[PDB]
Amino acid sequence: CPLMVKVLDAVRGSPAINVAVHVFRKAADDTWEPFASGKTSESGELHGLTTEEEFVEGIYKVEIDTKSYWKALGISPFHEHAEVVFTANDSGPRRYTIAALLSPYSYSTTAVVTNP
Amino acid sequence: CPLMVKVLDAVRGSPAINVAVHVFRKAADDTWEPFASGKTSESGELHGLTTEEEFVEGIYKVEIDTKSYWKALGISPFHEHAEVVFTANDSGPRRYTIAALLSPYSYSTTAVVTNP
Amino acid sequence: CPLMVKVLDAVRGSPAINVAVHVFRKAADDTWEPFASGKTSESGELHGLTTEEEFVEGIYKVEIDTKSYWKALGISPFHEHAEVVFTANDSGPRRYTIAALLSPYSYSTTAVVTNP
Amino acid sequence: CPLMVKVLDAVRGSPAINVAVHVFRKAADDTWEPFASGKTSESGELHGLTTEEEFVEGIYKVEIDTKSYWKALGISPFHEHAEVVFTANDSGPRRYTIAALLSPYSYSTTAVVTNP
Ligand SMILES: [Cu+2]
Ligand SMILES: [Cu+2]
Ligand SMILES: [Cu+2]
Ligand SMILES: [Cu+2]
Ligand SMILES: [Cu+2]
Ligand SMILES: [Cu+2]
């Protein structure tokens, strides 16, 4: 993968399992175009979103559907989503990991960029 | 001020001054109606977005735009568009503080909800 | 108050009330001398730890103890001992705010340094 | 590994490479006893700190030497360390990952516990 998402749950101290993730890419008309989506695995990871050939230079939006996650567990959270926007491949091809840490009233997101 | 926004820069341990903030409210037809807007002061806060008379039950979006903040540091390239969507006053009136913590590859946001 | 502590609970999106805070200052012999202590108020803040006359250049430790906070929620088991160590006023006097964000398996802390 | 540490740099959007990590275990006399230490790899990970047989029930302290890290890069940070305290194996044997996100004025730490 050049693009991985990883989601952690701060309440339970576990990976967030089975969370919906939607990735969008900013188009020429200046809207968000759907790019990929998936659900996190037992380990809280989502691999296989794209190929290197399909993950070109651009602006991407990762949208994690955290409200459904917290409601599945009986908790009414604050946010609808955890979002993060990043700019890809301005200097060509790279591994990208979007790490997200969730709690009912707070979250953080991080983009890690690695040249293998 | 039942609604307040505070923005901080985690590299420089400073308030983020002149961050544009826009707030929207979901209408009956499911479009986003404009609700309030402002800039963060010297202490990174924005108060006076609304009154309790106008801040009714609903679904609200707060968008922060950090462009002016970065530009004036002489960091033109990186800047942030961040958004939270939440449900307000569903169990009666509350004071909301939306706090955001910025960094070049990471973003955190937290919400503090009290009852006076 | 050139030194302030703010504690927030990220599960409940609330201030943490009655958190004991202790502050220490490194002495000439490299032992930690007691400097100040207090409890967080209703809004999760502690002010009045010191004056600018007493808050001189030095290396300071701030310890937060969340036991009373958890106990009163009926969460006895989990509680936190957290500590930050930092250098204060090295380039002249500054106001410091040490903010902490608690959760069962995660902890965040941030420092905001301004110059009045 | 039943114990891994993972450190990320929020400024550069990379793993934190070559950071010193010290792990302590709380002893019977109620002091911190040294348990293990190591440096993060190219990927920001430290594996091999212990065996399952040696990582028994107890209270552990992970101390990341972040000040040296930031100074290596030319930045005068706020904190001396990123710390985290956790309780291990109260319910027997588990994989533990201590994830840390660093910036010069803020950090977060998370303990992830997984039953393989
Ligand atoms: Cu959605
Ligand atoms: Cu309408
Ligand atoms: Cu813009
Ligand atoms: Cu002395
Ligand atoms: Cu204690
Ligand atoms: Cu050390």
Residue numbers in the entry:
A (entry chain A), B (entry chain B), C (entry chain B), D (entry chain A): 10 to 125
Publication text:
Soaking TTR crystals with CuCl2 or FeCl2 at acidic pH induces a change in conformation comparable to that observed for the TTR-rhenium complex. Indeed, acidic pH and elevated CuCl2 concentration in the crystal soaking experiments favors a change in the TTR conformation in the stretch of residues 72–92. When TTR crystals grown or soaked in 30 mM CuCl2 the conformation of the TTR-Cu complex yields a distance Asp-38–Asp-38 of 25.0 Å, a Thr-123–Gly-83 distance of 25.7 Å and a Leu-110–Leu-110 asymmetry, which are comparable in magnitude but opposite to that of the TTR-Mn complex. To conclude, the TTR-Cu conformation provides an alternative starting point for the design of molecules that aim to stabilize a form of TTR with an enhanced Aβ-scavenging activity to counter the reduction of TTR expression in AD patients.
Human transthyretin (TTR), a homotetrameric 127-residue protein, is the main carrier of thyroxine (T4) in celebrospinal fluid (CSF) and the second main carrier in blood.
